[PDB]
Design an enzyme around this catalytic site. Structure first.
Site, PDB file in Angstrom:
ATOM      1  N   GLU A  72      -3.033   1.672   5.909  1.00  0.00           N
ATOM      2  CA  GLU A  72      -3.951   1.224   7.024  1.00  0.00           C
ATOM      3  C   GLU A  72      -3.965  -0.114   7.269  1.00  0.00           C
ATOM      4  O   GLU A  72      -4.772  -0.806   7.972  1.00  0.00           O
ATOM      5  CB  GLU A  72      -5.376   1.545   6.392  1.00  0.00           C
ATOM      6  CG  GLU A  72      -6.697   1.681   7.560  1.00  0.00           C
ATOM      7  CD  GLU A  72      -6.305   2.631   8.445  1.00  0.00           C
ATOM      8  OE1 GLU A  72      -5.398   3.662   8.279  1.00  0.00           O
ATOM      9  OE2 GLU A  72      -6.911   2.419   9.665  1.00  0.00           O
ATOM     10  N   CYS A 148     -15.242  -3.472  10.628  1.00  0.00           N
ATOM     11  CA  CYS A 148     -13.947  -3.056  10.152  1.00  0.00           C
ATOM     12  C   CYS A 148     -12.899  -4.213  10.782  1.00  0.00           C
ATOM     13  O   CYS A 148     -13.083  -4.987  11.848  1.00  0.00           O
ATOM     14  CB  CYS A 148     -13.272  -1.849  11.018  1.00  0.00           C
ATOM     15  SG  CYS A 148     -13.899  -0.357  10.146  1.00  0.00           S
TER      16      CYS A 148
END
Length: 182
Positions: A72, A148
């Site tokens: 990720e 994020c």
């Protein structure tokens, strides 16, 4: 408010930009030279906005472990006229658990945001949005949309970037020194 927040602020003030892709606005951590990181779900393309300025992407690599499992993290090299302060000496060399971490975010929606998240677990495997993911850190804070790419720090270490949450827990992808050898 104390020395954890001092270290987090020092990183935010010199080593972050606001990145915009077609998938949103993200906190983006600059690591050294013109190299930065962002969650892979940002879907970086050939062009990105950096502090609302059109910027060519010279390279972008979505990292996977040697079992070909998602990590990720995307490493981006930016066609920018200025280098980041080199912070590679603040990156951990190995997977670990941590005490007393701070999550720091800087976007148009959440400027100058700092969250004391407390204890950070080496969680490891996570099914993140349906995608098997390794090297996940977990903290027991109800993180929200807009965080994020947020930077996770302890005093003296930059340990991860926020990549998701389940409403009660928040999850970060590890940053390791070995990702940024040149």
């Amino acid at each position: 408010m104390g020395p954890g927040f001092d270290f987090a602020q020092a990183i935010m003030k010199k080593n972050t930009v606001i990145a915009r892709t077609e998938k949103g606005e993200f906190t983006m951590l600059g690591v050294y030279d013109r190299v930065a990181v962002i969650p892979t779900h940002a879907s970086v393309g050939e062009i990105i906005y950096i502090n609302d300025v059109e910027t060519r992407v010279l390279d972008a690599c979505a990292l996977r472990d040697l079992t070909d499992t998602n990590l990720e993290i995307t490493i981006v090299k930016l066609d920018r006229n200025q280098k980041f302060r080199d912070i590679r000496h603040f990156l951990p060399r190995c997977e670990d658990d941590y005490n007393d971490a701070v999550l720091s975010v800087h976007t148009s929606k959440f400027p100058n945001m700092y969250i004391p998240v407390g204890q950070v677990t080496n969680y490891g495997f996570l099914n993140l949005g349906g995608t098997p993911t390794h090297r996940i850190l977990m903290y027991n804070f109800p993180t929200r949309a807009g965080q994020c790419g947020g930077v996770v720090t302890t005093t003296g270490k930059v340990i991860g970037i926020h990549v998701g949450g389940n409403g009660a827990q928040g999850f970060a992808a590890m940053l390791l020194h070995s990702y940024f050898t040149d």
